[PDB]
Design a binder for this molecule. Structure first.
Ligand SMILES: Nc1ncnc2c1ncn2[C@@H]1O[C@H](COP(=O)(O)OP(=O)(O)OP(O)(O)=S)[C@@H](O)[C@H]1O
Lengths: 247, 273, 439, 260
DNA sequence: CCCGTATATT
DNA sequence: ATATACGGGCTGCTGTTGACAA
């Protein structure tokens, strides 16, 4: 394994690492035959986030699977990704050598333990419904909500419109009924009342990474109980997020 | 009971946002008193009592209400209201209306405009608890006794900074008011003693002009208070008004009067730290 | 040759467990009656599992869950490199109770029923003990799948278990109970014999098999705990070891003190009372009071109170009672200050125990215990409630006639007051003190 | 009245004192040339300052030198009592008087018509070590900038227990190592850069230092413009800083630490 | 400690 | 004819130093 990242890709790599840290507690590193894969899974295994990086830096695997505590990586790339080059290899130790301005070089040796291969099963083709929209609109749509919320419900109203609500399970709390218009979204294959209920934190990490170059999301929601899929496509970057729905 | 209010003007909405932020910083749970003419922010209890008077006709263009004794008392958390109003800084229309969807609620609906033709609508349902009439007397505006000394206040920023730096040394403060516009802040510990002086504060013309022939100008009616409630009151303020007055009595009371734009603030800080 | 014998001979099938069949059957019928009668409207529930360490509570549950195809959810404490610990715990609980796993890559797929197992409780739960009650109430309100709690307890020093579940949340939350017992000698004997036979059949070299005479010695000094027994067997088979400390189960220590197991005065050279102390001759004793009191892990001032409560019923004469009472009073005197209360405390307990033991001359004559000692339970001191009532009544007398002496001088006047006055909650207090039963 | 001192820019003294503030007590030294405040900890680490007579406008001393011990936190709080964020155009003036042994220290402050008076009673003295680092036995010396190590020393607070410093003429010219829970972290600094004003190391030197003693150097590094590192034959470390004020003068702060 | 009782097993 | 488990009684009444969660 040998990767040499040069340019502004360091910032987007750090943002992806931050989103994964916001989702999961451990980081799975897997060199595939077509690039690098970063994987993370929630503690209760109710959410799964994967970033596949198309060959863009130097990718060359084999001369092959690891997992690391994620707080260490998060701290390293929060304090050391503001930096003109990055180098990643596998000695034996994981070297995260980081070239900097002038002649300063910083090296980071880390400890890893053997783990199994993590994967999931998603069927985007099997999903009837489909929704597409720019990420900025959705990010603006989730701003009025308080930062202490747990569950959010997405639905399609009567009249071809979207609706985001606040699911609550006599000292109650506030409720929100934010609504949008069909003229902002670009593609809707929906129905006359199909709605789903999911979490918020992983969605917030997804939106945080998706609010950089004005990317477009894609939601494939199905009947309640079945998982939802959030897919982000870019030039040289693929990402897929799988959540769970209340049944 | 019915209550509906409409806000469109940007400046009035900004002023309402400032007032809500100030009351949220000052207190946690507050009482709103709606009258046919005006709005009142009340807090009664540390026995700090808080009164804020606001003219209704200068903020809302449409304002209708109904409660014989047309008077609405509501008890609610200020943080919810502040968060609701925070999202309407760049809004267009705001509507406040009493409703009973699930539980007694004070619905706030804000119409957000953007580049899209469709206008977004954001709705919030702040819970309310209607206080029965039996307690209506206990929330009345606190009485202001005859002040021993009435003195103009200095600039609030310097006083706030001095008090904030004074907080570290001890938890006791002494305020002294003179008849020649001298304000003294004193702390006296077993290791360090600090005294800060203010002069050239214009004494307003007192109503009683026949009780100054036997009262020494150099005399004072200083009092001592715990420095935990003064600092909040100075930190909450963000703009310096033009009606900064302090009324000090000898026994157990200090009182503050402020007035900015069209909003009046009455502050009551008990003595005997 | 890479794992210990504890981790190498684990029970795969149910029949390889070292637990009595009835307990396994009870856990199994509870779990299977929950699974079979799983109503769609069934709410949450909490199961409590207790027992001394090293009996096999976790392994039997895991085996029974795997046999019937049940998903289990563990709870491992997160590792720090702001959010509170309780916040993380509640978030995990909500996620586990609400949603399900996605697909994984190779699992026991056909699952829609699961249980949550929590063993590694956080420290804040031990310090506070009041967040747990709110968490349990919320779970009972919003629970779907049952919650199983596993606790490890010893005979003396059981503060954590009673602090966590103080008989009130169990009563008002409808929590069940299942208690294990130490493994019987025969079961451990047969399993140890099987293990040593398996090692012997390995051959490889001429190694001395451990002697049989030490094999029951290994099981005798372990008190029904498999893991230390296997560890000691591994240590001893290298060519007694495993002296786990005992806790003595305080209610057993009280009986040991109060029953005075005596001997028949075997011929020895013990000193005798020469001429005039002929009424103080006693038979040989086979108990050391100091070790008994120390091993119960209790403060001395509490042991003396329990002895004072429970020592009367075992006596038959009055003079011995007088002597024992005098000894107890003298033991009390030595601890009445505050600066030197902890410097000398062993004297009081030792004096009290030896006085109560020696003063019983009726019982202390060897072959004179036939017959009696019926099925009698002990009790608890009554001084605590009376003292607390005295203190609260002290305050209720002071602050409300404040213009101890008031209870000693003014309260006699109150007892001879008996006239009404202007209040509502005070007439009840007046009628409280002054209406003691009297014919 | 022994010594009296007056000034119109409290900020210079305030920042000089804040650059050395990590203990609770300090010892002063008033001499015909100026003041000198020193502090020590663990009988190994010692930090000293210097405020020459050039800064002062009204300085008066009597007879010989004057020594007294003062609490540093209270004095620093009293100095900056008018807010540590003045807009350009606002200044504060101070006057201080010490009337010999057995009497407290006066402090009268004034700004824009507001006058404050405070007193600090002093209970002196203590004894100081003899950390003589004259430039005669010094073997390794380097001079370098601050913006290079702003983040570097900011990226130095972990759960480790020992910091390793190695300097050699060749290969790792100036390398810092930190061994913690996760792993090693090297921060090699080469020569011929924008922050390498003079490299004159003679022989290789590798040493270990305690994090607890060397941590409070961050405050001196933040409010500085240049840093000089010196180490002798035995392995004692001397750090020299250079701070400037608004008027455009220069003051120095020195740190002395001993190896493990 | 203490007494009496219901079940597995040879 | 012999080994093993139920039944009933416990959380409880001034000073100087130290660890934990925020
Ligand atoms: N027949 C057996 N029965 C039970 N455990 C066995 C047996 N044979 C081997 N073991 C081993 O003993 C372990 C039992 O662990 P224990 O510590 O007794 O379980 P435990 O109930 O969790 O104890 P705690 O939690 O400390 S109270 C198993 O995990 C096995 O590794």
């Amino acid at each position: 394994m040998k990767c040499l990242v040069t340019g502004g890709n360091v910032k987007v790599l750090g943002k992806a690492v931050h989103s994964l840290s916001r989702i999961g507690d451990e980081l799975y590193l897997e060199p595939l035959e077509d690039g690098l894969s970063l994987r993370t899974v929630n503690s209760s295994r109710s959410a799964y986030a994967c970033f596949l990086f198309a060959p863009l830096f130097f990718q060359q695997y084999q001369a092959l699977r690891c997992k690391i505590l994620m707080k260490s990586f998060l701290s390293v790339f929060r304090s050391l990704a503001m930096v003109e080059k990055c180098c990643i290899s596998l000695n034996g130790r994981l070297v995260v050598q980081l070239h900097c301005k002038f002649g300063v070089r910083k090296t980071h040796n880390l400890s890893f333990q053997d783990c199994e291969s993590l994967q999931a099963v998603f069927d985007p083709a099997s999903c009837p419904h489909m929704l597409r929209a720019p990420a900025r609109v959705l990010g603006e749509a989730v701003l009025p909500f308080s930062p202490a919320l747990a569950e959010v419900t997405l639905g399609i109203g009567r009249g071809r419109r979207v609706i985001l609500r606040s699911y609550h399970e006599t000292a109650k709390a506030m409720v929100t009924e934010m609504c949008l218009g069909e003229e902002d979204f670009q593609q809707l294959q929906a129905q006359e009342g199909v709605a789903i209920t999911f979490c918020l934190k992983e969605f917030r990490g997804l939106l945080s990474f998706a609010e950089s170059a004005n990317l477009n999301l894609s939601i494939h929601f199905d009947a309640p109980g079945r998982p939802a899929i959030f897919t982000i496509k870019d030039s040289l970057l693929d990402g897929h997020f799988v959540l769970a729905t209340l049944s | 009971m019915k209550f509906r209010a409409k806000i469109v003007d940007g400046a009035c909405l900004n002023h309402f946002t400032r007032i809500s932020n100030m009351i949220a910083k000052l207190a946690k749970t507050c009482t709103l008193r709606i009258s046919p003419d005006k709005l009142n922010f009340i807090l009664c209890d540390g026995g700090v009592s808080m009164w804020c008077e606001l003219e209704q006709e200068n903020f809302f263009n449409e304002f209708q209400m109904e409660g014989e004794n047309n008077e609405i008392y509501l008890e609610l958390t200020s943080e919810n209201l502040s968060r609701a109003l925070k999202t309407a800084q760049n809004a267009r229309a705001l509507k406040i209306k009493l409703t009973n969807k699930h539980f007694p609620c004070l619905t706030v609906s804000v119409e957000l405009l953007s580049m899209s033709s469709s206008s977004r609508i954001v709705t919030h349902d702040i819970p309310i608890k209607v206080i029965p009439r039996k307690l209506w007397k206990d929330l009345q505006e606190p009485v202001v006794p005859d002040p021993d000394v009435s003195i103009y206040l200095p600039v609030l920023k310097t006083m706030k900074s001095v008090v904030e730096k004074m907080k570290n040394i001890s938890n006791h403060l002494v305020i002294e008011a003179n008849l020649d516009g001298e304000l003294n802040l004193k702390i006296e510990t077993e290791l360090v003693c600090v005294t800060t002086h203010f002069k050239d504060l214009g004494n307003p013309p007192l109503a009683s002009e026949s009780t100054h022939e036997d009262r020494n100008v150099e005399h004072m009616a200083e009092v001592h208070i715990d420095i935990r409630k003064l600092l909040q009151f100075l930190a909450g303020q963000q703009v310096n008004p033009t009606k900064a007055l302090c009324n000090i009595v000898n026994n157990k009371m200090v009182h503050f009067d402020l007035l900015h734009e069209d909003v009046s603030l009455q502050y009551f800080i008990p003595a005997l730290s | 040759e890479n794992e210990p014998w504890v981790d190498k001979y684990k029970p795969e099938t149910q029949h390889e467990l070292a637990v009595h069949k009835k307990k396994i059957e009870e856990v199994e019928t509870w779990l299977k009656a929950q699974v079979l009668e799983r109503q769609p409207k069934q709410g949450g529930s909490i199961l409590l599992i207790t027992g001394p360490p090293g009996c096999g509570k976790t392994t039997t549950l895991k085996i029974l869950s795997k046999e019937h195809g049940i998903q289990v959810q563990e709870w491992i404490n997160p590792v720090l490199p702001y959010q509170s610990q309780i916040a993380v715990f509640k978030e995990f609980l909500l996620r586990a109770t609400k949603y399900n796993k996605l697909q994984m890559l190779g699992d026991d797929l056909r699952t829609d029923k699961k249980i949550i197992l929590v063993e590694d409780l956080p420290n804040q739960f031990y310090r506070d003990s009041h967040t747990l009650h709110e968490v349990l109430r919320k779970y009972v309100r919003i629970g779907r799948c049952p919650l199983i709690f596993i606790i490890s307890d010893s005979l003396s020093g059981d503060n954590n278990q009673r602090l966590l579940f103080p008989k009130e949340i169990q009563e008002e939350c409808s929590i069940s109970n299942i208690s294990f017992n130490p493994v019987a000698p025969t079961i451990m004997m047969k399993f140890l014999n099987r293990i040593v036979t398996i090692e012997a059949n390995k051959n490889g070299g001429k190694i001395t098999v451990p002697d049989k005479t030490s094999l029951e010695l290994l099981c005798q000094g372990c008190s029904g705990d498999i893991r230390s027994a296997i560890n000691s067997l591994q240590f001893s088979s290298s060519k007694a070891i495993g002296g786990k400390d005992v806790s003595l189960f305080l209610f057993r220590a009280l009986g040991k003190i109060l029953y005075c197991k005596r001997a028949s005065l075997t011929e020895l050279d013990s000193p005798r009372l020469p001429s005039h102390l002929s009424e103080y001759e006693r038979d040989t004793l086979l108990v050391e009071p100091e070790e008994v009191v120390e091993m119960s892990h209790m403060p001395g001032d509490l042991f003396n109170l329990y002895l004072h409560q429970n020592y009367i019923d075992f006596f038959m004469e009055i003079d011995d009672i007088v002597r024992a009472s005098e000894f107890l009073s003298f033991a009390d005197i030595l601890s009445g200050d505050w600066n030197t209360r902890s410097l000398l405390r062993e004297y009081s307990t030792s004096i009290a125990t030896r006085g109560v033991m020696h003063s019983n001359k009726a019982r202390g004559y060897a072959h004179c215990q036939g017959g009696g000692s019926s099925f009698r339970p002990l009790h608890k001191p009554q001084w605590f409630l009376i003292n607390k009532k005295y203190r609260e009544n002290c305050l209720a007398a002071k602050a409300l006639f404040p213009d101890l002496c008031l209870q000693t001088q003014l309260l006699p006047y109150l007892a001879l007051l008996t006239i009404p006055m202007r209040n509502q909650a005070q007439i009840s207090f007046i009628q409280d003190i002054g209406r003691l039963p009297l014919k | 009245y022994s010594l009296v001192a007056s000034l119109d820019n409290v900020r210079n003294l305030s920042t000089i004192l804040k650059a050395i503030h990590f203990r609770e007590h300090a010892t002063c030294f008033a001499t015909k040339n100026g003041i000198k405040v020193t502090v020590e900890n663990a009988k190994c680490v010692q930090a000293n300052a210097f405020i020459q007579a050039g800064i002062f406008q009204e300085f008066k001393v009597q007879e010989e030198s004057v020594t007294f011990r003062i609490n540093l936190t209270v004095l620093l709080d009293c100095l900056s009592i008018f807010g540590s964020s003045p807009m350009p155009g606002t200044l504060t003036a101070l006057r201080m008087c010490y009337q010999g042994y057995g009497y407290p220290l006066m402090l009268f402050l004034e700004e824009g018509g507001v006058v404050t008076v405070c007193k600090i009673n002093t209970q002196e003295p203590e004894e100081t070590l003899d950390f003589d680092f004259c430039s005669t036995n010094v073997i390794n010396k380097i001079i370098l900038q601050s913006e290079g190590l702003r983040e570097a020393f900011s990226e130095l607070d972990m759960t480790s227990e020992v910091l390793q410093i190695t300097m050699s003429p060749d290969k790792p010219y100036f390398r810092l190592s930190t061994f913690g829970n996760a792993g090693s972290s090297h921060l090699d600094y080469p020569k011929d850069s924008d922050l390498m004003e003079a490299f004159h190391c003679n022989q290789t030197q590798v040493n270990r230092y305690k994090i607890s003693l060397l941590k409070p150097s961050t405050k001196a590094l933040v409010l500085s413009c240049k840093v000089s590192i010196r180490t002798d034959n035995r392995g004692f470390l001397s750090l020299q800083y250079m701070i400037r004020n608004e008027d455009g003068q220069i003051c120095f702060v020195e740190y002395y630490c001993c190896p493990d």
